[PDB]
Design a binder for this molecule. Structure first.
Ligand code: HEM
Length: 407
């Protein structure tokens, strides 16, 4: 076939569902870089994608992504019992009490950043989110963060995912940021192991520093560093969803009123933000053995891409996926395959994001503050979603003016 890399890069979120619409199917054979790729979309496709007897991640991860977005040696590259034992380390972090502690730290950091925002008079809301998230998640994770370094660390953490998917010299910064952040986290792990850093027994950094693998060995300091960044970086990336929260409040009538007066609405709202808005485009795996599925060949070694955005906008699952309607979540059956903004399947037995509880609790804090606490004006701007950007954002970055707080 022809190489469709540039077409994908031009339309990362929609490329797959669009061709699926053109072809009248939930899957199509394509080619990105050198490799023939099966592209899949929808609930049934996701379910076979998460079948670990048919798919592996080891031979999947494009090694320019490990130099920016993910690091080398982390949980995303693992399969089988090695993966499950590493994944359990992340899952133990996510108790309701610890998730709530992080949400509270973030609300306090949001409230502390507001006087700064007022004094600026006008802010790019997205730009302003990285630092309070960095301060909160570092504190929560037992990562010391001096006051005068937070701004810089936040910038480096942001560069890992926002300068990563960037067809620009911004890629060089992303790579330097990765080496800097990995070296920084490694010094954190080393200090914890030597006893010069007193991170608490319940914190991410402690758990990761002291984790023993299936051979009863500590992770090498660099692998532990990568796994710690796998907590810090994606927590900072919640800036994107918080920006989408403000965007929904501004562009969809009735949403604000419902949030203020209906206590159960907020949970429905944050879920619909995750379903509706583009964030993580697609996940990649490799077929581990020859099989056939719905007339399509999956030879051993075939790269397979599961389209998350398309699956989240699948009309067989949702009725009117194109509409933004939190109420749709009253009727959701909690299926692990038909709603997949951060992966599908089981958290313990597959690669599904262990960050979902944190994302939900932090988006709830955001929605609460933006309706019950924050006061702000929204000038004329281009709020349209930039579907060509990774991550996608309102083109303006959501601009606020005259910002102040209450309690
Ligand atoms: C900010 C919004 C987030 C989005 C859009 C997102 C999305 C995703 C997606 C699509 C995957 C891959 C699932 C797969 O490979 O099948 C993933 C995995 C992962 N996420 Fe997130 N996530 C977010 C937040 C978080 C947070 C807050 C954490 C903090 C702990 C986190 C930690 C991880 C880790 C460690 C993995 C790898 C898990 C594995 O391979 O088993 N993520 N996420």
């Amino acid at each position: 076939g022809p190489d469709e890399t540039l077409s994908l890069l031009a339309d990362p979120y929609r490329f797959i569902s669009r061709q699926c619409q053109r072809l009248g199917a939930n899957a199509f054979e394509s080619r990105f870089l050198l490799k023939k790729t099966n592209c899949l979309k929808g609930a049934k496709a996701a379910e076979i994608f998460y079948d670990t007897t048919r798919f592996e991640r080891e031979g999947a991860m494009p090694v320019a992504i490990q130099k920016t977005l993910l690091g080398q040696g982390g949980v995303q590259g693992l399969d089988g019992e090695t993966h499950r034992h590493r994944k359990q380390m992340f899952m133990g972090l996510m108790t309701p009490e610890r998730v709530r502690a992080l949400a509270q730290l973030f609300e306090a950091e949001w409230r502390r950043a507001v006087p700064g925002w007022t004094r600026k008079g006008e802010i790019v809301f997205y730009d302003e989110l990285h630092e309070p998230l960095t301060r909160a998640v570092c504190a929560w994770a037992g990562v010391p963060l001096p006051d005068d370094e937070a701004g810089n660390r936040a910038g480096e953490l942001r560069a890992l995912f926002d300068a990563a998917g960037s067809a620009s010299p911004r890629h060089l910064w992303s790579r330097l940021a990765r080496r800097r952040v990995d070296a920084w986290a490694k010094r954190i792990i080393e200090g914890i192991r030597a006893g010069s850093i007193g991170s608490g027994s319940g914190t991410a950094a402690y758990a990761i520093a002291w984790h023993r693998d299936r051979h009863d060995d500590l992770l090498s300091p660099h692998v532990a560093a990568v796994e710690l960044v796998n907590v810090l970086e994606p927590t900072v990336a919640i800036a994107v969803y918080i920006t989408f929260v403000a965007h929904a409040l501004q562009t969809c009538s009735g949403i604000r009123a419902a949030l203020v007066q209906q206590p159960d609405y907020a949970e429905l709202f944050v879920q619909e933000v995750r379903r509706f808005y583009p964030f993580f485009p697609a996940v990649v795996a490799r077929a581990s053995q020859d099989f056939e599925w719905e007339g399509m060949a999956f030879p051993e070694g075939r790269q397979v891409v599961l389209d998350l955005y398309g699956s989240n906008h699948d009309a067989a699952t949702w009725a009117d996926p194109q509409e933004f309607r939190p109420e749709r979540f009253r009727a959701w059956d909690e299926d692990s395959f038909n709603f997949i903004p951060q992966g599908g399947g089981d958290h313990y037995l597959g690669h599904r994001c262990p960050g979902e509880w944190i994302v939900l609790a932090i988006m709830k804090v955001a929605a609460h503050l933006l309706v019950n606490a924050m006061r702000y004006d929204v000038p004329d701007q281009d709020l349209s979603i930039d579907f060509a950007r990774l991550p996608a954002l309102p083109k303006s970055g959501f601009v606020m003016r005259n910002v102040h707080i209450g309690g």
